[PDB]
Design a protein around this ligand. Structure first.
Ligand SMILES: [Zn+2]
Ligand SMILES: [Zn+2]
Ligand SMILES: [Zn+2]
Lengths: 101, 350, 48, 146, 49, 33, 97, 46, 335, 67
């Protein structure tokens, strides 16, 4: 339950899902590029970007401004666990083949 | 003098911009472009007309078993030794001279010919160095002479002049981690990654050929001749390259250091010989808060080294007047410059 | 000349902070054939 | 300048302001000052400061602007032959201002043959990224190579 | 060498003109308050803006 | 509103030093000279 | 004497006259304290109207502050770090001067 | 050896008294250098 | 376009993924799985002990690209970092010599250890099952056997070339008894650390510790890892005969193949070509040929230092990302 | 001074190969690239350092303090 992972940025977001900017400390384009592809194929998702402010320090902004219907964090949760399902499917296929050689 | 370093001409990592090269970690980590920097500080030891030598005495060792940190920079000899990190503030030679050494000797002495004002010289600088070698030896006049050499290796930190040996004279830009900047097929990752815009206006295609020749020679397994109106010509390399599978144009696809997709234009990249220069930043970066003042003009001292202060020239100064800033002059040319109060007399002002 | 500096230069900073990644991500470079004249023109100039 | 502290060791500015200094980087050694008394601070920053001096007087012209990369980079995104999709534009508009902003998406440059947006748009948002963006602009002129 | 002379020319070119300012009359004056020009450029308008 | 606005906000306001900006301004960077 | 013609017997009207001679470069041209010097390197993600000043000079590059009111709850702390780490101070000057 | 130091040319272990002379013994050659300390020393490679 | 990147002489085309239902009036391929689970597949090229190669299919750029990234950087590994010396006289400066050691690979299974705290000091730092340390000391000995001159400086001088095999190890309490079947071994036991000659000696012990590759390449278990993005050459018209036999000499040897003059030039296989694209330089092959590479398909291979089996590398690498996302969701976001 | 154990790009272990290379050049003189090619060097950045890196330590051991 570490209170430092990501933070809702009140500066960027307005209200009610829609725009939400979540700066992930201690992470990189691995999770960003990996995740955006997942996120955008959730129907409600509209603008899911990310960037580092600068490689000169480790901080990672991720960005979702979407429609009404569901809520910002709900996307990141949903498609995030979807990215978990990715991981399982990956090891599912891969380790199957390799143990079967 | 230099490295043979692989590069990809590209504007990647907009930290690049103008002439400013940019590098690869897990390469600098792998030993790319590293420099042992050696210096020496001699201290002459001469006898003084009082006939008392200038002495090396040292090794205090209070505290029950250790010499104080400031004085912990040695061993029982009383002088610097091999293989020690020395942080600035320490003693890399302890030189004790008699404070009466310059006095007028008389046809008498009794017991103490000591009276030493000891002036050991202190390593000063931002970053630890090493004493790996020292010399006690004599000059011609038969006097003790000590010479030590201090060294520190410099990982090529941000802001180092890197010549491309073809005329490209540039600073190392913001050091990339690893993944960022491309990799391509066999996964070969460029080391230096350099802006194209230098080539059009500086208008030098010689390097642009040199890269071709480089990717060639390795692939045939040769060094590559070139010389004025001579050396290996270009066309031959084409076949030389294509047979082994690289585009004769000397270009290839790469893949996004970040995104991991195809790069939207073929990139010209390969081997080029680079080199590292003097004017290492760590030498050059210079700053003060309140530094010494010179007795005659009572104000900051001259340039780098001794200590700081920087130059507002007239031609430099007056630029502020175009903005007409009253106080910026005062704080700048007065309150922070020479802080003084004259006392005068209304009647007959003096 | 319209909206004043603070938002003006802001438009710049978002400009650059765009390009410095985008230029890089897409990629741009030179290549020999761009400098190299391809057959053709060398005959024209060669006469000229 | 408002000074921001960062690691390593050197002076680092935003390249668009190079042209006043005509700094080629390379060996160039700047001269860094901090003031001491207060009134000189508000003086320098709020008068002599960058944004105020954004135009250079003699020409009555904005000396500071993008050079080199940022120009040619723009020329690629600006270029007519380009396009962008929902993803590509998204991550761009992100990378344009690293986060921190609400946005709005103008209708797609094209339609039933998929959907896209062109550079002219995605750059248009660079000027007016949002609703609440007070930067309503009309402009026209010749560039060079016309 | 041209940059040499040019720099010098900026020094001197300043000097004779080194102090000239605009007063609240829209009348540019020197310092000791002899008047150099009445309405600046017949305009009074900053070439900058 | 725009025109006369800018025109009014375009003026020398007192205290800005012209001579200096002119100083800075000039120098940089058949037979006749 | 000497008399191999030592050149610069001159000490005075000189020391007041040209170049490093005071009344231009050592007086109107004063070499001023509280400064710093380094080479450059580009930072685009840094906004315009900044300069990245490296922490290592910030440690020695200081600014005068008169504490007031609002200041303590920052400044009372800013001491507890001390000169070593960056978000801190070094010199203190009391009200009793 | 754990004694003090070495020649320049002759290159042999040699000690010295306090305030005696720098000339080596094995060789008449004057200059000489100092052996590396038997004391421990530490880096971190990275 | 149909997972095939446009390949041209002056440019390349058709890049970003483009499978998601953002950009299409017909909105399809919206996430799910099953379509993907049952759709996604994989192949294996071959394996080594120290190197792996295989084939991947039906996924995007990103997650694979991440796998490369987290591979070359984030996967933890154990290597020498901190260095101890008992003197040294040798010619290499002890700095460089140090920088040489930890930069060598070491074959030992990670996860046999833990991470080390940054905080706790001194002896607390390097402890038992959380730590390794090795030592080497050799003094060169002039061999009384000197059959000739200018022979190898071993026939001159015994053990004048220090190798990785020369690197020995000190086990410790519970540190010894656990690795009995898996003693530490230094990658390639033959590597030149230093050269020297008699009267010269080096004594050292440096700590091999777990680390993360992104921070230093000496922590990379992976010499290199890359997905060569699979090309697909598409052919047009019979175009047979002599210049068709030339048409393969245009490309690398395996490439296409010549069945018969009438049976023209048939593709043997893809993936044997560097996409070096000079069917586009001669231009008379142009309209009868086109080029392509496939987004959905990945040539992939991994050069691993030899520490562990590279199949373990990639296999772990994903699970690290699983650990990452799983770890992340469970943490609530502050407001 | 001695061949870096890993290259500046791949960082594949070079160290073993130098000796085996140099011997493979002296014993059985053979074409450079091909040597490396049948020594197992493919990547050219990996390759440059075997085609390059003049050894300075052997030319140093001429000079040594101890002799
Ligand atoms: Zn008086
Ligand atoms: Zn001797
Ligand atoms: Zn390599």
């Amino acid at each position: 339950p570490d209170r430092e992972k990501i933070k809702l940025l009140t500066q960027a977001t307005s209200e009610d899902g829609t725009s939400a900017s979540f700066q992930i400390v201690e992470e990189d384009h691995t999770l960003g590029n990996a995740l955006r592809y997942v996120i955008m194929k959730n129907p409600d998702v509209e603008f899911c970007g990310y960037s580092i402010p600068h490689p000169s320090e480790n901080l990672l902004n991720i960005r979702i401004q979407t429609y009404g219907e569901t809520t910002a964090v709900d996307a990141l949760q949903k498609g995030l666990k979807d990215l978990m399902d990715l991981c399982d499917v990956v090891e599912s296929k891969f380790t199957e083949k390799i143990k079967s050689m | 003098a230099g490295q043979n370093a692989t590069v990809a001409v590209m504007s990647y990592s907009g930290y690049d911009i103008e002439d400013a090269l940019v590098l690869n970690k897990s390469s600098i980590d792998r030993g790319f472009g590293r420099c042992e920097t050696r210096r020496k500080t001699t201290t002459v030891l001469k006898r003084y007309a009082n006939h008392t030598q200038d002495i090396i005495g040292g090794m205090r060792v209070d505290e029950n078993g250790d010499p104080i940190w400031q004085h912990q920079s040695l061993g029982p000899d009383g002088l610097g030794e091999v293989g020690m990190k020395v942080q600035s503030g320490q003693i890399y030679i302890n030189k004790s001279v008699p404070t009466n050494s310059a006095d007028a000797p008389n046809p008498n002495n009794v017991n103490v010919q000591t009276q030493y004002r000891e002036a050991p010289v202190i390593y000063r600088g931002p970053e630890p160095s090493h004493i790996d070698q020292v010399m006690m030896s004599v000059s011609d006049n038969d006097q003790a002479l000590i010479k030590v050499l201090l060294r520190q290796n410099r990982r090529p930190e941000l802001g180092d002049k890197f010549s491309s040996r073809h005329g490209q004279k540039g600073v190392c830009g913001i050091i990339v981690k690893q993944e960022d900047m491309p990799f391509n097929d066999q996964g070969i990752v460029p080391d230096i990654i350099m802006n194209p815009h230098g080539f059009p206006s500086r208008m030098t295609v010689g390097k642009m050929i040199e890269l071709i020749s480089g990717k060639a020679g390795v692939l045939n397994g040769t060094l590559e001749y070139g010389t004025c109106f001579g050396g290996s010509k270009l066309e031959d390399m084409s076949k030389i390259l294509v047979d082994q599978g690289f585009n004769y144009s000397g270009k290839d696809m790469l893949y996004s250091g970040i995104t991991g997709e195809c790069l939207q234009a073929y990139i010209f990249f390969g081997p080029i010989y680079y080199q590292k220069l003097k004017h290492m930043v760590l030498d050059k970066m210079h700053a003060r808060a309140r530094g010494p003042r010179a007795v005659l003009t009572r104000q900051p001292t001259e340039g780098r080294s001794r200590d700081g202060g920087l130059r507002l020239g007239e031609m430099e100064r007056d630029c502020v007047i175009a903005y007409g800033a009253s106080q910026l002059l005062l704080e700048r040319l007065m309150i922070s410059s020479d802080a003084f109060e004259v006392d005068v007399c209304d009647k007959c002002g003096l | 000349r319209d909206y004043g500096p603070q938002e003006a230069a802001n438009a710049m900073n978002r400009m650059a902070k765009l390009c410095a990644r985008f230029l890089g991500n897409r990629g741009f470079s030179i290549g020999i054939n761009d400098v190299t004249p391809a057959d053709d023109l060398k005959q024209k100039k060669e006469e000229l | 300048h408002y000074a921001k502290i960062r690691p390593w060791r050197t002076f680092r500015l935003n390249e668009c302001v190079c042209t006043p200094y005509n700094a080629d980087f390379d060996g160039d050694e700047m001269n860094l000052h901090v003031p001491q008394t207060e009134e000189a601070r508000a003086e320098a920053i709020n008068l002599m400061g960058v944004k105020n001096n954004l135009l250079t007087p003699k020409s009555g012209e904005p000396i500071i602007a993008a050079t080199q990369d940022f120009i040619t980079g723009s020329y690629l995104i600006s270029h007519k032959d380009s396009f962008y999709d929902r993803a590509t534009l998204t991550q761009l508009l992100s990378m344009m201002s690293d986060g921190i902003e609400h946005f709005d998406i103008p209708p797609p440059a094209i339609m039933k043959p998929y959907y896209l947006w062109t550079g002219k748009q995605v750059f248009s948002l660079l000027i007016k990224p949002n609703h609440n963006s007070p930067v309503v602009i009309n402009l026209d002129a010749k560039n060079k190579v016309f | 060498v041209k940059t040499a002379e040019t720099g010098y020319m900026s020094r001197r070119l300043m000097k004779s003109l080194e102090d000239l300012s605009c007063q609240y009359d829209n009348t540019v004056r020197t310092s000791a308050n002899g008047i150099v020009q009445f309405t600046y450029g017949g305009d009074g308008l900053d070439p900058l803006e | 509103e725009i025109a006369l606005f800018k025109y009014r906000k375009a003026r020398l306001e007192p205290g800005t030093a012209i001579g200096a900006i002119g100083a800075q301004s000039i120098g940089e960077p058949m037979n006749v000279t | 004497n000497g008399g191999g013609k030592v050149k610069p017997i001159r000490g005075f009207c000189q020391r007041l006259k040209g170049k490093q001679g005071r009344f231009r470069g050592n007086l109107s041209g004063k070499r001023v304290d509280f400064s710093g010097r380094t080479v450059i390197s580009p930072d685009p993600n840094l906004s315009i109207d900044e300069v990245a000043v490296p922490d290592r000079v910030a440690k020695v590059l200081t600014y005068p502050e008169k504490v007031t009111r609002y200041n303590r709850h920052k400044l009372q702390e800013l001491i507890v770090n001390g000169p070593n780490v960056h978000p801190g101070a070094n010199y203190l000057l009391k009200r009793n001067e | 050896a754990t004694l003090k130091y070495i020649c320049a040319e002759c290159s042999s272990k040699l000690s010295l008294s306090r305030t005696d002379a720098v000339r080596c013994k094995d060789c008449g050659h004057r200059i000489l250098l100092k052996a590396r300390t038997k004391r421990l020393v530490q880096f971190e490679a990275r | 376009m149909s997972n095939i990147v446009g390949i041209e002489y002056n440019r390349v085309t058709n890049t970003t993924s483009t499978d998601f239902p953002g950009f299409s009036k017909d909105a399809e391929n919206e996430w799910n799985v099953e379509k993907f689970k049952k759709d996604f597949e994989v192949n294996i090229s071959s394996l080594d002990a120290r190197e792996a190669n295989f084939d991947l299919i039906n996924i995007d750029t990103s997650i694979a690209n991440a796998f490369r990234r987290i591979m070359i950087s984030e996967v933890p590994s154990v290597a020498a970092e901190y260095v101890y010396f008992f003197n040294n006289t040798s010619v290499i400066q002890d700095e460089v010599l140090a920088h040489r050691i930890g930069l060598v690979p070491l074959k030992v299974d990670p996860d046999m250890l833990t991470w080390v705290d940054s905080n706790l000091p001194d002896d607390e730092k390097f402890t038992d099952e959380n730590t390794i340390v090795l030592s080497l000391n050799v003094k060169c000995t002039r061999n009384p056997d000197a059959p000739k001159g200018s022979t190898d400086p071993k026939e001159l001088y015994n053990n004048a070339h220090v190798y990785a095999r020369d690197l020995k190890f000190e086990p410790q309490g519970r540190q010894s008894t656990t690795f009995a079947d898996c003693p530490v071994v230094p990658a390639d036991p033959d590597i030149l650390l230093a050269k020297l000659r008699p009267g010269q000696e080096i004594s050292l012990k440096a700590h091999c510790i777990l680390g993360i590759g992104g921070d230093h390449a000496k922590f990379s278990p992976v010499s290199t890892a890359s997905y060569r993005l699979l090309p697909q050459i598409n052919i047009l018209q019979p175009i047979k005969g002599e210049s068709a036999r030339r048409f393969q000499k245009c490309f690398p040897p395996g490439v296409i193949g010549i069945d018969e003059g009438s049976d023209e030039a048939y593709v043997k296989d893809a993936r044997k070509d560097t996409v070096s694209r000079e069917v586009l330089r001669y231009e008379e092959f142009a309209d009868k040929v086109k080029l392509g590479r496939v987004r959905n398909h990945f040539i992939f291979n991994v050069e691993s230092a030899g520490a562990m089996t590279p199949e373990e590398i990639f296999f772990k690498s994903v699970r690290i990302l699983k650990n990452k996302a799983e770890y992340l969701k469970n943490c609530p976001i502050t407001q | 001074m001695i061949v870096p154990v890993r290259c500046f790009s791949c960082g594949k272990v070079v160290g073993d190969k130098w000796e085996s290379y140099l011997n493979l050049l002296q014993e059985d003189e053979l074409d450079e690239g091909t040597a490396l090619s049948r020594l197992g060097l493919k990547r050219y950045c990996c390759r440059r350092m075997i085609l390059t890196h003049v050894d300075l330590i052997e030319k140093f051991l001429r000079y040594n303090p101890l002799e």
